[PDB]
Amino acid sequence: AAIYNIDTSSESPDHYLVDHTLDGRVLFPATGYLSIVWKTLARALGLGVEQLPVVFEDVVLHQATILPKTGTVSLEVRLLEASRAFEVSENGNLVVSGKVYQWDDPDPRLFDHPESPTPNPTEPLFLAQAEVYKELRLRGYDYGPHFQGILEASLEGDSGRLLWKDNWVSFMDTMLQMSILGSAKHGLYLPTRVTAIHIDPATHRQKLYTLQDKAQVADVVVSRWLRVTVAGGVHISGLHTESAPRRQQEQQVPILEKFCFTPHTEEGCLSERAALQEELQLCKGLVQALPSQQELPRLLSAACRLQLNGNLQLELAQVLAQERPKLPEDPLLSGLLDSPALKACLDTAVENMPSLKMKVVEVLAGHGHLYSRIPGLLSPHPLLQLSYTATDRHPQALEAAQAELQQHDVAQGQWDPADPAPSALGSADLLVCNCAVAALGDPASALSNMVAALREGGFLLLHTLLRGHPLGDIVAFLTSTEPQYGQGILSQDAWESLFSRVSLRLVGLKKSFYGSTLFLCRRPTPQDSPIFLPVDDTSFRWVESLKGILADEDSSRPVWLKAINCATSGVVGLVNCLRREPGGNRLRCVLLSNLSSTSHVPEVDPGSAELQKVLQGDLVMNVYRDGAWGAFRHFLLEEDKPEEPTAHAFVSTLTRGDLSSIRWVCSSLRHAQPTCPGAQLCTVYYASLNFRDIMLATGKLSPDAIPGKWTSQDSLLGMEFSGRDASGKRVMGLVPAKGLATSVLLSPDFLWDVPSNWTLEEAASVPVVYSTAYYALVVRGRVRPGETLLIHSGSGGVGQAAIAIALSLGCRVFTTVGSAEKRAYLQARFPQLDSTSFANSRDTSFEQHVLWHTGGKGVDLVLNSLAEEKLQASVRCLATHGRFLEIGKFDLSQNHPLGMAIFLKNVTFHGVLLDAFFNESSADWREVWALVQAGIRDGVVRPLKCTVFHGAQVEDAFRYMAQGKHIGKVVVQVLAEEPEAVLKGAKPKLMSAISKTFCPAHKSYIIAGGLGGFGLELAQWLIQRGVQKLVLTSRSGIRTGYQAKQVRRWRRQGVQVQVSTSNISSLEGARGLIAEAAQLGPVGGVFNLAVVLRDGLLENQTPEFFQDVCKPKYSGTLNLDRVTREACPELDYFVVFSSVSCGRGNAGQSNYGFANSAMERICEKRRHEGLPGLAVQWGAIGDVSGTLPQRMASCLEVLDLFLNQPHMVLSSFVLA
Amino acid sequence: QHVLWHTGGKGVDLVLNSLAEEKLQASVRCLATHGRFLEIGKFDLSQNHPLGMAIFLKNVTFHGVLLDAFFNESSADWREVWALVQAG
Amino acid sequence: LEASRAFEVSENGNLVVSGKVYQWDDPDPRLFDHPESPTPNPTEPLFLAQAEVYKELRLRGYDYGPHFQGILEASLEGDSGRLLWKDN
């Protein structure tokens, strides 16, 4: 009863277990159980572990134990010496069981490395430790340093070389890692059963040898033909790994956003919306001549109902349901605040300030309520630190809602705009008022106090209702009792005049269609002589001038970077990085980037008043585009997943195991390139739901369990279907997977013809059930007429098919059903059955029924699908020469035992699996096909009872099937059946489904710098879309074991992968690269991932560094952009990978940000002409600035959305 | 190892096993998909030794063969084997 | 081994008995109801008394002594009878 406590604390000797993290959670190594069992045995025999050669057998792990972050878990070990059995328990729960015993006579010959199947190519390349553990991480294993024991491994992973740190657990776990490395099955697989393990410490010591370094190693060899792993004095055979659930919780949540131009001044922003239009229509109507839930219409209804005209001021001002401060809740009053315009203004303020910290104070927060809306908008900024505070007219105001202020870091204040601000607030960084609902004490006094309270160069943001607009007049008529609120409404020209009187400058103005406006003004700053340094010059020789200018740390003159000769200049990304470096405060950018030649190009000469206006503004960003001055701003991306109308969709669960996530997604059949002899596309009208589909949808069955090569991402729901052939013929088919969709592609050998009398609905239930019944009985069981049969679950589809087949032969059938109604249904459907033919299937009582009613002889043929105890009971029902047809999976998957004594009865035991036909042995499938055809034409085959669900209600169908009350089969009417027999117009009706990315097999795709880190992942992701034509570019070619491994794997699958080594920086190189792709086929898309980086503060930077950094990205994007428009009418994607460094800025990477921004400009230009174009801004890629690295799975998942998303530039990152 | 190697790791379709104990278990691991295991031995059957049922996940038929079953109960099943032997 | 509800009886390190034993969570008397006799034969004029039954057993080779002589009677076919009880 040995007891082991596993403590992972730093002091505990088992601290190394912390490094065995799989799927993000620490797990006790499968070999740890072997280690503790070995130690327990050695203690039992009184020997030492090093002196005890041991043998394990039939090791089976019944669950996984999770080592907690804190605390300890006790593992108990019990040994049965007589039976040589052992049992490990956790809180009295079985964990590991098997057999362990001493090895009497160790045989050194056992550990000699077996014959190598390969011809010993002696290839030079091999995976180093870093590459091995990078691949393992990509697969999902996160071993730490203590479990990083593989020094190297061959490309195919058959042989390697492991470290020996005098730890058995690590060594054996490393052996398991080597075994898993060679497998092609993507996913997280863990050991479940091991046939036998032999450990011999003496030969282990003999085998170990020391490299030139003192580290000890031990060669490892993995033989998949023999299913054995040998390394030093250890020998593992018959390992069996099973797919882990792989579901990780609290996954990363990237902040998806778009990056679009935004004019400084804009009016009529909300004109797009309609609810606001209807609200305004209602409001104006109720005022004519002097009925909804919205507060303002309610107030107008109060003003009218109480009295049609001449309403008392008291009643209109004071009345229930209106005196409540619900005015901001009215959609019209909050139209601008909900719009992105507020975010644009806030970002404009945040950009123009030296300190990374913000000090913003709200006034009259009792009514403005901006405190509940401003801080949330600023969460996306990674490093921004905010010091917000809400101030009201009197402390009694905003007395409630304190918890809202508590959740945020908002402080309290008691400043009245009438008087000057208290010293505590001081020179605030930003002032937010919300004059729309809050009542100003007075315009002049409020502005005079606020401007004083605002630091020099600070920003003042105001929201109100401009006088003279219909809404302004409407509000003026009401609230006549609140003269302060009346003072808060003035004409836009009145505001203009008021700003000048207070020596304040307007920089931004967002106006709604109904008069609501969002002013943005900043306190002027002492004018100083600026510097105008042009940057449009190529060769970056201007960098020296800029570096010199910033050298004068004493000098404080503002520095203006001027770019007025290249719409593709990346100065916007340049300044962002510089502002995070010393002397970056003085930086200020002016850019002219008209996307249309016809657009006017203004002059920015110092004399030109146009330049003077922006100089007065003094904004960091001054981007001019088509007669407008604005800048690029980040906005959150719409959450809805884009959908499109299509005729090729399939049903899939977006989130594994969640029936609520079932939805229609676009199918890869949209291209249907492989339409040829040996396959054909068939329209789908009805699709059936089998038990396996429910198991997949519920998540209880892994996709890998389905035989066949399946993409890591793909939908495998549905096996049957009935619908019209490509020629209009009515047919019913059978597919390994993807049956539940609007179309299916299958070989003609799996199609039957629906008889005239049948209907497409009926035929949808025949194929799988009758095919499996015919196979299991006739082909395998070889039933003969007159024999006795036991058919468990007669009410099921397979049960009904088997019953129908058996009766036709004239056989006595015993069947088991779960409830009385099913028994009655069967009795009605099969009159031959009598009362002595039904037994209960939820209980083992059927065993006595069969034995009694057969005189104790038993049955000849058993078609079992039940559980372990039911199965064992069923075996006892077999007669001499019996035959056990088994179609279940639980016992077989679990490898439960079976007493071989039953075979003394001369019985036969069959493992029936229809899935084998799809993979191979299609020659023998035609036998079952002919059987089913004969049964159809001879009347033996009858369609089952079908419950129909429409396509939209597929989730309801899954729910109903899961409940388990159905009798017969459940089908999904994808498309109704036309009365006509043969219809030429077999085109599926257009449907709206989620949009995915798929690539034709007859197009070529280029990935500049594809051999890099992220490049290989992108290439593999594309291959999962069936690219079948790929060109990867790299200056140095293939020079790493990982790259060669991946490339050879792709070539093996049949993809034509080409490595060009043709630079895109030179125009001729780009043209040659494009021409090379055309040889394989027309160019589908080009991806630019080339990058060469040289960091350093601008002082260290030199023109050579800028040229190097911009050579692959800026110049290459220009070239590839020129060569694609000229030579690629077919191409549909022009993707480019920018970085968060630009847009968000990053210290010491000015050249990198410049290159990325200039690159984004090209993509913006291309879209304007309708050509494909997309620049993606990534924060940090994990597996290969205040933001965490982003896992590759999440990166590719996001990339899939962006391809679908319309915006020209998009970004994604993970907050700290 | 000999069979799993010279067969390319696939195995053998038919196994006519008469060995016992561990050697029986070793034989089962030589089976290939759609294989058939003919068990003409009798020891492990008499001892009711366990058989892991996971082997059946590969379509596999496990036959318990007893020639003497023909003698005790007369049946036409024997005339088939008689004809086979005569033809041979 | 309560975890796997398996017991084992050993003698000087030699395995003797092995199996699974566990508490019966939900006993139900219906299990102990007597199944019907396949052959009715309600008459049963004659039956084997204790002396006769054990006389036959010893002829076959079983020499149980008085403490193990519990069968008070049994039908000729030997499918039913009455057994003694002595808190053993």
Ligand SMILES: NC(=O)C1=CN([C@@H]2O[C@H](COP(=O)(O)OP(=O)(O)OC[C@H]3O[C@@H](n4cnc5c(N)ncnc54)[C@H](OP(=O)(O)O)[C@@H]3O)[C@@H](O)[C@H]2O)C=CC1
């Ligand atoms: N090896 C092969 O060739 C193939 C194997 N099969 C096997 O056929 C077997 C039977 O399939 P089929 O009869 O069509 O399946 P169904 O789900 O239609 O079976 C319904 C019957 O089984 C029970 N049952 C099965 N699934 C459920 C459920 N989700 N909820 C409630 N009751 C359920 C029902 O109640 P009750 O509990 O009373 O029985 C009913 O009697 C499966 O185990 C499958 O693995 C099928 C085709 C290929």
Ligand SMILES: NC(=O)C1=CN([C@@H]2O[C@H](COP(=O)(O)OP(=O)(O)OC[C@H]3O[C@@H](n4cnc5c(N)ncnc54)[C@H](OP(=O)(O)O)[C@@H]3O)[C@@H](O)[C@H]2O)C=CC1
């Ligand atoms: N943290 C991150 O990783 C982030 C990623 N990104 C973007 O992700 C994209 C993916 O690449 P990434 O993994 O970052 O970079 P890597 O350097 O890892 O991979 C890109 C590869 O491009 C190749 N390359 C460089 N110059 C050229 C050239 N002139 N012609 C052809 N190939 C060239 C290099 O291989 P070789 O040396 O053989 O030429 C290099 O390995 C990049 O465009 C980057 O901007 C941006 C933001 C975040």
